[PDB]
Amino acid sequence: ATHEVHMLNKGESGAMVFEPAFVRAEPGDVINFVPTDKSHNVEAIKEILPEGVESFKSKINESYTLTVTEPGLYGVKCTPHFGMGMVGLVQVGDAPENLDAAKTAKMPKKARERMDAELAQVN
Amino acid sequence: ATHEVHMLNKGESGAMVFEPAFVRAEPGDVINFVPTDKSHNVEAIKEILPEGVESFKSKINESYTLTVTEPGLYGVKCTPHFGMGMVGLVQVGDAPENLDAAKTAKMPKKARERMDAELAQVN
Amino acid sequence: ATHEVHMLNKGESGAMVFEPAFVRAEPGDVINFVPTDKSHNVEAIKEILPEGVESFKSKINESYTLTVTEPGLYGVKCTPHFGMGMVGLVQVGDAPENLDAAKTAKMPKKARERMDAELAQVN
């Protein structure tokens, strides 16, 4: 299954957001990160990735296709807007092993707020 | 401004969801609830409404337009899927007075989980 | 099956548009007409409706749910923006009987341009 995430200046939840900010996916699914508005990218949050998953960082304004082969949590940020709290979370499969890492990862205050909100969606 | 909320069997955050589940709006805005999938409606959570706002309850399978004139939090549920956690939250203006009412409102376990996730977005 | 059509100020195809401007649907499907931007509505083009289908006209800024029970072509306009060419076309089933009516219906020049474009999608 394929899921789409937009990078927005002003979304339903607030400013400088990934929308949806949380995706529950299954191993092997595809996540498409697509700008709606210019100025944004998608970059892995190093500390919030499953074992073995390589970091990624897209170029500003390009669509990025992520295949989530590995189960766990994948945290993403928008590089220029990380401090503005522009972060997203993809849960791949049940009972992610790296939940504690996602809860304790250091990031800017507003990013940590939005990440805690996303974590509240884990199921 | 208009805002759109989809009523879904299976959304990015899980089964039986409003998507987006949280909307930040301004006084006077309209929230359109869209029957993307059949079987859903929108109904006020009477314990999560600003002062002076009337309850509402749409018919299954219809569009519903909520005009949010008064500031504060508006909780919504889908009537047949309340116990499956199909609840949403609209924040109108800054510093909603009824935050605590929304934190404590009685509801089915899964609805309370989702509602806590929505609350985590208030800003 | 359900299909969604947005009412936009500026879409990929131009200004004051329904997007998608053409939907191929099957009898019994649902069309959701949803504003993305304020100022728009959906109204039937009288002369482009199947036999027996009643006209409709939504209120500005509200989502409108149309069940396309009857086969044929359903032409729609946005009332205030008809002259700006804000029109859409829904083909319900094969070989619509009212094709000639859709080709010859009088409307403002820009509406006729966009309707001819939509007609070029009939299949």
Place this chain on the structure above:
Amino acid sequence: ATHEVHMLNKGESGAMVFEPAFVRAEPGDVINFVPTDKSHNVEAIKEILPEGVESFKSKINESYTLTVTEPGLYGVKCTPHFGMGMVGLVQVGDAPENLDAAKTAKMPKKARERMDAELAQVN
């Protein structure tokens, strides 16, 4: 500005489509082609490109970002689905010089049908 085009097995206009199939853009804009469904790519129709623009051909299942620097018409096809009519058209600037080239370019019957529909949108 960014623009998004989805690559779909089944879209609103029929099977094997770019959606939107026609994009109006400005010099410098980017067009993101998004693999919403697998099995697709984007490839230039070399007979429908402005002067001085290089051909391109993406890999199946990947995002592709086309930067449209030069004014005129850019025709695109999905390589495995060209005969199934999976073609798109991007208009960059006013009064494209290569309109006639796009009207007459040789292609499979269904691709020519879709391409004529896209052309009907040029303005």
